[PDB]
Ligand binder design. Structure first.
Ligand SMILES: C[S@@+](CC[C@H](N)C(=O)[O-])C[C@H]1O[C@@H](n2cnc3c(N)ncnc32)[C@H](O)[C@@H]1O
Ligand SMILES: COc1ccc(C[C@@H]2c3cc(O)c(OC)cc3CCN2C)cc1O
Length: 336
C-alpha cells in the first residue's frame, strides 16, 4: 500500500506471481496514460519536447551465474522467436541472423559492435564471416575477458575487443559496419554519440542501431508517481531512456536513415520469459554461484529477486496489448 511496504513484502517472497504481474501491468498502464495525447498535434508537441530535452543533456555478476540465467551466448537483449517451441538458444541465433541481414554484413568487412556485452553477436559474425575483422567494444573488463576466452575455444582468429567507455574512446580507425544493440538506451548524450559514430565511418560504412522503444512516445525509465516502486527498483539510477520508434529520425545531424523497422514486443516478452523460467529451473545452482562474491545468502536473494522482478516486469511491459506498445526499433544509416 506504500513504497517500503511493497518492497518489504517483495524481498520476502510474500507477493505471489499473479499479484506481482498485475501490480506491474498497472504501473505500465499508467505510463501509457501519461504518454498518449488526444490529438496528433499534441502528441508531436510532447515528443518534440522530449527530443529537444535530449539535445541539452563496479561489481559484475559472475559469468557462471549469467550462463545459468541467459541463453548459450548470454545475449542481453531481445531475441527473435520463430516458433512457439523456439528455445532461447534458437531465438538468440535467429536474432543474430536478422541483425546480419539488416546491417547487410558481408564477408571481408571490418565490423564494430559497440556495447557488445558477452559478445554473442561478435562471435556469430566472426564464425559466419571468416574474412570479417570483428571488434567488440565494451566498458566491462569481465565481458572483454569472456569474449576473448570464447573466441579461443571456437578457434576464432578474427576477433579483437576494445575496453573503453565509448563516450570517452577516441580513435582514427573507421569501419565498414557499426552495430549498436541495446546500448543507446544507456547513452547520456545521443546527438554527441551519433556524431562520434559518424567519425568512425567512411562513405561506404553503414550503421545499425537496435533499441527498446514505445511505438508512439519516449520516456525515461523512472517513477511517474509515488505508487511506482518498480522503475526505481530495476534501474536504481534510471539512466535508461526509452526512445519512441521514431526518435532517432530526429538525430540525423551526422548520419542519414536508409531503412527503419520495428519488431513486435512479443519477441522481447518471450526472451525475458525464457530467462525467468531458466533462472527458476537453476535456482539453487544460481544461489551457490553467487554466495562467494556476495558473501551473504540475503545479498544473493537480493540480487536474484531483482533479476527476477526485471524479467517478470519486462514480460508485462513488452507483452502489453499483444506486444503492440513497447517493442524493439531498428534503423540503418549511412554517413552524411
Ligand atoms: C543491454 S547490454 C547489451 C549487450 C549486447 N550488445 C547484447 O546485445 O546482448 C548494454 C551494453 O552496453 C555496455 N555499455 C554501457 N555503457 C557503455 C559505455 N559508456 N561504453 C561502452 N559500453 C557501454 C554495457 O556494458 C553492455 O555491454
Ligand atoms: C546500466 O547498465 C545496465 C543495466 C541493466 C542492464 C539490463 C540488460 C537488459 C536491459 C533491458 O532493457 C532489456 O530489455 C527488457 C533486457 C536486458 C537484458 C539484461 N541486461 C543485462 C544492462 C546494462 O548494461
Amino acid at each position: 500500500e506504500s513504497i517500503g511496504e511493497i518492497m518489504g513484502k517483495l524481498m520476502q517472497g510474500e507477493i505471489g506471481d499473479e499479484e506481482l504481474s498485475k501490480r506491474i501491468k498497472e504501473i505500465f498502464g499508467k505510463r501509457l496514460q501519461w504518454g498518449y495525447k488526444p490529438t496528433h498535434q499534441q502528441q508531436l508537441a510532447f515528443n518534440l519536447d522530449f527530443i529537444k530535452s535530449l539535445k541539452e543533456m563496479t561489481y559484475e555478476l559472475p559469468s557462471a551465474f549469467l550462463e545459468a540465467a541467459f541463453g548459450k551466448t548470454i545475449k542481453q537483449s531481445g531475441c527473435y522467436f520463430k516458433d512457439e517451441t523456439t528455445t532461447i538458444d534458437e531465438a538468440e541465433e535467429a536474432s543474430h541472423e536478422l541483425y546480419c541481414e539488416r546491417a547487410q554484413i558481408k564477408d571481408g568487412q571490418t565490423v564494430l559492435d559497440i556495447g557488445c556485452g558477452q559478445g554473442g553477436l561478435v562471435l556469430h559474425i566472426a564464425q559466419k564471416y571468416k574474412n570479417c575483422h570483428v571488434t567488440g567494444l565494451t566498458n566491462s573488463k569481465a565481458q572483454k575477458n569472456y569474449i576473448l576466452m570464447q573466441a579461443e575455444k571456437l578457434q576464432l582468429s578474427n576477433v579483437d575487443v576494445i575496453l573503453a567507455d565509448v563516450t570517452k574512446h577516441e580513435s582514427d580507425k573507421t569501419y565498414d559496419r557499426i552495430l549498436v544493440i541495446a546500448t543507446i538506451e544507456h547513452m547520456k548524450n545521443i546527438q554527441l554519440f551519433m556524431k562520434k559514430l559518424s567519425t568512425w565511418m567512411t562513405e561506404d560504412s553503414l550503421l545499425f542501431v537496435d533499441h527498446i522503444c514505445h511505438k508512439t512516445f519516449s520516456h525515461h525509465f523512472e517513477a511517474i508517481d509515488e505508487d511506482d516502486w518498480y522503475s526505481g527498483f530495476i534501474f536504481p539510477k534510471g539512466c535508461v531512456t526509452i526512445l519512441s520508434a521514431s526518435a532517432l529520425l530526429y538525430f540525423q545531424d551526422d548520419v542519414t536513415i536508409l531503412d527503419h523497422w520495428v519488431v513486435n514486443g512479443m519477441h522481447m516478452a518471450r526472451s525475458v520469459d525464457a530467462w525467468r523460467k531458466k533462472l527458476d529451473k537453476n535456482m539453487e545452482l544460481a544461489r551457490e554461484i553467487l554466495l562467494p562474491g556476495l558473501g551473504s545468502k540475503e545479498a544473493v536473494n537480493g540480487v536474484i529477486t531483482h533479476i527476477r522482478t526485471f524479467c517478470m516486469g519486462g514480460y508485462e511491459q513488452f507483452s502489453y496489448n499483444n506486444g503492440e506498445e513497447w517493442m524493439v526499433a531498428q534503423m540503418l544509416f549511412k554517413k552524411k
